Amino acid sequence: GIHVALVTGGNKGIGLAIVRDLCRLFSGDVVLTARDVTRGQAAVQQLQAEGLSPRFHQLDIDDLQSIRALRDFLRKEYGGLDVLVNNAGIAFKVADPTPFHIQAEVTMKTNFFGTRDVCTELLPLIKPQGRVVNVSSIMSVRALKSCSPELQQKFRSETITEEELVGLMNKFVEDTKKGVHQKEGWPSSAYGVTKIGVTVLSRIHARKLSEQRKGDKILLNACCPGWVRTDMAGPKATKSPEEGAETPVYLALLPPDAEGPHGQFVSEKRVEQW
Numbered sequence: 001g002i003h004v005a006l007v008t009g010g011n012k013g014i015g016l017a018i019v020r021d022l023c024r025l026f027s028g029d030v031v032l033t034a035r036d037v038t039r040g041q042a043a044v045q046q047l048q049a050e051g052l053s054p055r056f057h058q059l060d061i062d063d064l065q066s067i068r069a070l071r072d073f074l075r076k077e078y079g080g081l082d083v084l085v086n087n088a089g090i091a092f093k094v095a096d097p098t099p100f101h102i103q104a105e106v107t108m109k110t111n112f113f114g115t116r117d118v119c120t121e122l123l124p125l126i127k128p129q130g131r132v133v134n135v136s137s138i139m140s141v142r143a144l145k146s147c148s149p150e151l152q153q154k155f156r157s158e159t160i161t162e163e164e165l166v167g168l169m170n171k172f173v174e175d176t177k178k179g180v181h182q183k184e185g186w187p188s189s190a191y192g193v194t195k196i197g198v199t200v201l202s203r204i205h206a207r208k209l210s211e212q213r214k215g216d217k218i219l220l221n222a223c224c225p226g227w228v229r230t231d232m233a234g235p236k237a238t239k240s241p242e243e244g245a246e247t248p249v250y251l252a253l254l255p256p257d258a259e260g261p262h263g264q265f266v267s268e269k270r271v272e273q274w
């Protein structure tokens, strides 16, 4: 009955710092995952040289077969999962020349659909007193404010369903392909919209857990890790990966029986208004 925590996108950046902290603070096994097996194994070796003992499993959140193989591994080895940190994500660099509609499709595929597929496959494995942490971004809040009032209403809704949200996320991508995203009320940041998806998906999944698994004391939240020096944000950012890991780790390790936060967007360990 060994407890297990898992971090997606764990080979570098904020993900690696989360894995490192969980190795020290989580009472059980910690699984570092990475899409590239050599990069993941190198990260495990780095942490071993620091005196830590993470496990490794491959995971690419854009490959459903990869997610399913991880699901099967967790069921066989642990009988489920205690802590899930959905950290993996991508962004196009500012003024990357890639056509915007391609930036939209690609960023959405990973940040939203990939994250959603991991939740689809692994949420059923979450044990009582488990915790799920979805790494979103303050860019979701910024993007939300740049949406039309109609879209703001839909994304802030307490009654929105997962299928409605998926419809809206695909609508953004389709609108960019048709040359109509501005006209249809969307913001200019594709990354921002994908993080709207992550934030709102967390709200919905928290509602579903309270509906379907009441009594199991599972807490699920979205978070902003802050502005962190990584390959995504670059060297000018204000936080180290260590500092970036604090809020996700806080949310992952919420004491047993805690009533909240649940279904919240959390920054600097504090609940933000959506």
Ligand SMILES: NC(=O)c1ccc[n+]([C@@H]2O[C@H](COP(=O)([O-])OP(=O)(O)OC[C@H]3O[C@@H](n4cnc5c(N)ncnc54)[C@H](OP(=O)(O)O)[C@@H]3O)[C@@H](O)[C@H]2O)c1
Residues within 6 Å of the ligand: 008, 009, 010, 011, 012, 013, 014, 015, 034, 035, 036, 039, 059, 060, 061, 062, 087, 088, 089, 090, 110, 114, 135, 136, 137, 138, 224, 225, 226, 227, 228, 229, 230, 231, 232, 233, 237
């Ligand atoms: N200031 C910030 O850095 C900041 C602020 C707010 C929110 N965030 C969010 O924080 C999370 C971590 O970002 P970071 O700054 O640490 O970026 P990063 O240094 O680029 O690390 C991203 C991690 O995600 C992994 N990843 C990307 N696509 C994947 C996929 N399809 N399957 C599995 N893993 C995948 C990457 O793997 P590869 O090494 O193989 O590319 C890497 O391990 C992201 O969700 C990001 O949006 C970051």
Ligand SMILES: N[C@@H](CCC(=O)N[C@@H](CSCO)C(=O)NCC(=O)O)C(=O)O
Residues within 6 Å of the ligand: 091, 092, 093, 094, 095, 096, 103, 107, 139, 188, 189, 190, 191, 192, 232, 233, 234
């Ligand atoms: N055109 C893209 C913009 C995405 C974007 O903003 N990328 C930032 C990090 S995501 C938070 O804004 C980035 O890569 N910054 C560092 C750099 O530009 O070198 C979209 O619309 O999604």
Ligand SMILES: CC(C)(C)n1nc(-c2cccc(O)c2)c2c(N)ncnc21
Residues within 6 Å of the ligand: 020, 021, 024, 025, 242
């Ligand atoms: C206090 C925690 C558990 C967060 N911590 N952090 C760190 C730590 C220190 C420097 C960098 C880092 O990534 C983590 C640490 C350590 N080296 N030894 C013992 N405990 C440590």
Ligand SMILES: CC(C)(C)n1nc(-c2cccc(O)c2)c2c(N)ncnc21
Residues within 6 Å of the ligand: 091, 136, 137, 138, 139, 226, 227, 228, 232, 233
């Ligand atoms: C470029 C600025 C400084 C505006 N930036 N970028 C980010 C940023 C960088 C990479 C990813 C992300 O989600 C956000 C950021 C942040 N999280 N908090 C505060 N400021 C941020």
